[PDB]
Amino acid sequence: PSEKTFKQRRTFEQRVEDVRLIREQHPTKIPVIIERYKGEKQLPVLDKTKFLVPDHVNMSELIKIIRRRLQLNANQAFFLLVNGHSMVSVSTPISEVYESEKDEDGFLYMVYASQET
């Protein structure tokens, strides 16, 4: 097992350089880190945590992709918290979410949990 998050496993400079390369090789993708909330207990762990998401995909669509990857029941509660906090618009394309919520290192960080607060 690894206890470390992506940010704790890669230096700031390594992450900035990852984003630059992804930017040049995938100009219409947003680089997103999706991790399980640090003490989450109902939801399983995702197999992978690092994704490229097409600019046009909105949060509603991303949520349903991740839920399906987690093999969740339709009724199970799930929230995807961007840059620390519940997103109010779910129609917004992720390219625009990125503009308001991207980290200083250039990644977009999300955590998933069974509740919003």
């Binding site: 097992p1 690894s2 992978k48 945590t49």
Partner: peptide, 24 residues
Amino acid sequence: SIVDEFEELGEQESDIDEFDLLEG
């Protein structure tokens, strides 16, 4: 979600290499 790949040395023969992949 971490992987450590070890190559086994001293393995002849021949053109095939052995790796032990530890996934933790």
